[PDB]
Amino acid sequence: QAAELFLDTVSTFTSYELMDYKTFVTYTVYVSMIALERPDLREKVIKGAEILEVLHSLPAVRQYLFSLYECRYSVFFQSLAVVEQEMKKDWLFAPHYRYYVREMRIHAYSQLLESYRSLTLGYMAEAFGVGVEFIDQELSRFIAAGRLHCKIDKVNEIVETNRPDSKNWQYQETIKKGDLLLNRVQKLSRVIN
Amino acid sequence: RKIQLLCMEMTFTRPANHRQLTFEEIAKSAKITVNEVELLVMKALSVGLVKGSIDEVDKRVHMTWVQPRVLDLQQ
Amino acid sequence: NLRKIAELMPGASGAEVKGVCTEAGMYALRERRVHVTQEDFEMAVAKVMQ
């Protein structure tokens, strides 16, 4: 709900005093790539002529923006380390920036290896220049979470990726979901009503 | 051609759950290969004598033919 | 910055204002566009001078 609402708003509120701009379009262009879907309205972010001219004066979030779709990721992790220094400001803070760097990170890796049926160690090392163990421990933590489909196939040091689709996504989603829902009712539907 | 067609199709009494044989038809037909595999079941499959698909990478003829045929006193 | 529309207010009327604001809305509606720009006011008040 945050990006689109922001995205399709323009913002003006009694001389934008709660908007406190030099903040708003930035907040959009680093709230977008969490949930605004990378093909769909990310073009509406980029080729949308309402925001691109006011991030023109804001080159840091600009080079944070066109360093995803242009795959220049040796500057994108640099650009995201900037955001983890201006995470300090906003009072909506702590699991928002830890989760935020988590999902910028995971969306960045999942964007790369999805186009390939096999990902080599040298080309994944080419993403920044981090080498091996950053990708190894980190991606093993991500598949420990199971939120990408890759696996650290060190037998050849080439990462494999097919895609089991989101038919199973639902099942896994709804076990927990269902449980929680019933539990709430289980919290109520006893004598205490 | 015709007694090859019926009688080399009829000898397809393989209840073997789902009939799938080609290896028998290799030896049951005194004939060169895939000409014996396809063309017999090409014309057996155009008219209603044998219904079912064929894989020939697998060399696998699946059949679900109907042909109400035999008196079959002991059947 | 609504001043330029009020720039030619000269004898206007209460209505003469609700009319041009609805006509500016329709002149934004004609191009299937969901945001009333600046110039739809200008062709609204530049239309209604009749």
Add this chain to the structure above:
Amino acid sequence: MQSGIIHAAEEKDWKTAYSYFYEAFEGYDSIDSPKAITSLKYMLLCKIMLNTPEDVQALVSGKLALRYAGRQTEALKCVAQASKNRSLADFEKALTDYRAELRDDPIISTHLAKLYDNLLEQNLIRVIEPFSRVQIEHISSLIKLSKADVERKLSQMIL
């Protein structure tokens, strides 16, 4: 017409200000036939980008257009066949060919990059459509432009 041009320059027509291309523009009785050449040519030049180009050739079949057996009708008829037949083979049967001499015209060469990459998209689709896991030399060599466009396919399929 000029409303159509500047309301056509960047993105802001095809669904939006295509109406500018023929509203008062079909109020040209025949006094200016040459302006009728110009954005009759543009209206055919832009119904192909929204990618239901049946109104292009279906617009030539209308009563206003078999009065109008002109040169550029065969030009955007040729690009109309390029949009139906979905091939850069009909771009080299355009650009260099049957009606090549509408390459030199002002607001159009800017669109030829978008139209060029666009027909590269759906032409590359048509090459891929039956296949399952064929190699680059069929996608590349079955249109005969380069190999790198196939890996530029990598930079344009994604998702």
Add this chain to the structure above:
Amino acid sequence: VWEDNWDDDNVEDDFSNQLRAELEKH
């Protein structure tokens, strides 16, 4: 918040891991 985060164990984040990453490479 109220969607369960990890926030557990991990040493200083992508700023410092970025820093010793590019410094450890170079």
Add this chain to the structure above:
Amino acid sequence: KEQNGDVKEAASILQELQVETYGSMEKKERVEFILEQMRLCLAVKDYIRTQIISKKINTKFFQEENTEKLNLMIQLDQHEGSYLSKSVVLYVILAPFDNEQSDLVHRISGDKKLEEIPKYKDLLKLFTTMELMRWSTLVEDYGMELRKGSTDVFGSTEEGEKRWKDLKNRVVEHNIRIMAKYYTRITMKRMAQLLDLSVDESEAFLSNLVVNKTIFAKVDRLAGIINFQRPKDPNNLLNDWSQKLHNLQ
């Protein structure tokens, strides 16, 4: 005026003269002035407005009258386009449509009258029945009868060739409907020798046969070729299975 020689200079009595040349002409005259209007509307071929304009009052002479034989619409379709609306049957064979044409190829079938001409009943029993073909050995097998004997005009005539090449397509798209209607994966080589082509132009005819959306080909460069299968498991199989599911006197 026609013996001087003009194409669009006798068009002054072509572009006007609305329906039945006057407004229904009030007698025996049926097509005579639309007809002499119409074969002279052709006048080189002029490629559009002699068959597009003809269809408006094409729909007028439809009663089977007594009057005589006032071929023009034999001439009309012979520049472009498909044509469903001995010459009948051989004309019918070379059209590319499947199922209504399978109606159209034998809605005219089986005539005590079509009991005769048996060597062009071979196009019926051979072509209509889903059985194998050959590119030209049935053609050179019939080259003493299908060529001359007693469309495909040419001794040197233009476009009689390519329509005969269209008949080569009737070898191609017929048995791809057979292996498509019958088989799973075959081989690249075995399909490449069933149709006596190489790999490449068989794959080009195949790509032509899939881009127009006639079959469902999982064609492959390697051996996992044209498979007719749904490897996503829809429940069409489930549904199909459900569908399948004196002496006393």
